[PDB]
Ligand binder design. Structure first.
Ligand SMILES: Cc1ccc(C(=O)N[C@@H](C(=O)Nc2ccc3c(c2)/C(=C\c2cnc[nH]2)C(=O)N3)c2ccccc2)c(=O)n1Cc1ccc(F)c(F)c1
Length: 264
């Protein structure tokens, strides 16, 4: 299912694949379902236009991110099989996550129950701990960049790595131009946790400027249905002071998480 091949190579051409239905769209590329002709392996092929990548000044980010990603082997991170190119465009060979994005699940369910939410948060904390363990700090984490495996397991799908768009998930130190460390994504978990339970992120607003101020001020409120344990956890993660966010160990041990996650 996931342990295909570790020898990533660039002798792949478009003629190796039968192309299927469009899976999603982004600014630069379309992602398609695809099947490798020889093996019949189902995967997703994301197609990005080279000229657009260079024009936007992100091609170097892509080379470095691909190189990093090729090293990451983890059940809650989408596995990257390889890449190649022709004259017009650049092709990324990605794991196919059949149950789709958490974003769509949120749109379909309106909000998640504490069980879905705490399972998702455990999976994210595990994945970010693994990423942090190899010097790979993460940028923002969006429900759009969370996929679901055949058993409903979460897969981190965004390239927010290191050796923007909407800010909803960015911590103050990332938006105020301050210094940021691995604690940025702890902020991200609080934002995602809130959105999972509530159905929108804690600082959502009609305009970018309003949102900027709400994040900077940490101006958010809890609806009544949000339980005492979740309020406490979100409040621990959504701290202005990076130094005040917990370690991932502490997150995984939080009594609301331990009492609510469905992860055997
Ligand atoms: C901010 C952001 C968000 C998302 C991406 C991103 O690309 N995810 C890739 C992806 O979806 N894989 C994938 C694999 C198997 C799947 C599915 C999806 C799926 C269903 C589906 C689709 N849609 C809702 N459900 C299904 O059933 N099986 C992807 C790669 C290339 C093109 C499109 C998607 C991302 O890069 N960014 C960063 C970003 C980019 C451009 C900006 F301008 C910006 F500001 C920020």
């Amino acid at each position: 299912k996931q342990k295909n091949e570790e020898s990533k190579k660039r002798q792949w051409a478009l003629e190796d694949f039968e192309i299927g239905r469009p899976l999603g769209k982004g600014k630069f590329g379309n992602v398609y379902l695809a099947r490798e002709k020889q093996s019949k392996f189902i995967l997703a092929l994301k197609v990005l236009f080279k000229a657009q990548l260079e024009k936007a000044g992100v091609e170097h980010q892509l080379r470095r991110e691909v190189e990093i990603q090729s090293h990451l082997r983890h059940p809650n991170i989408l596995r990257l099989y390889g890449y190649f190119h022709d004259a017009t465009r650049v092709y990324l060979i990605l794991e196919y996550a059949p149950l789709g994005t958490v974003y769509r699940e949120l749109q379909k369910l309106s909000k998640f129950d504490e069980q879905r939410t705490a399972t998702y948060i455990t999976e994210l904390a595990n994945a970010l701990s693994y990423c942090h363990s190899k010097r790979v700090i993460h940028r923002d984490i969006k429900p759009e960049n969370l996929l679901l495996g055949s058993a409903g397991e979460l897969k981190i799908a965004d390239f927010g790595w290191s050796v923007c768009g909407t800010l909803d998930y960015l911590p103050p130190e990332m938006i105020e131009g301050r210094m940021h460390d691995e604690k940025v994504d702890l902020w991200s978990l609080g934002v995602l946790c809130y959105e999972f339970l509530v159905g929108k992120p804690p600082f959502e607003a009609n305009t970018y400027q309003e949102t900027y101020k709400r994040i900077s001020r940490v101006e958010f409120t809890f609806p009544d249905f949000v339980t005492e344990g979740a309020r406490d956890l979100i409040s621990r993660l959504l701290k202005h002071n990076p130094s005040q966010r917990p370690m991932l160990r502490e997150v995984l041990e939080h009594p609301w998480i331990t009492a609510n996650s469905s992860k055997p």
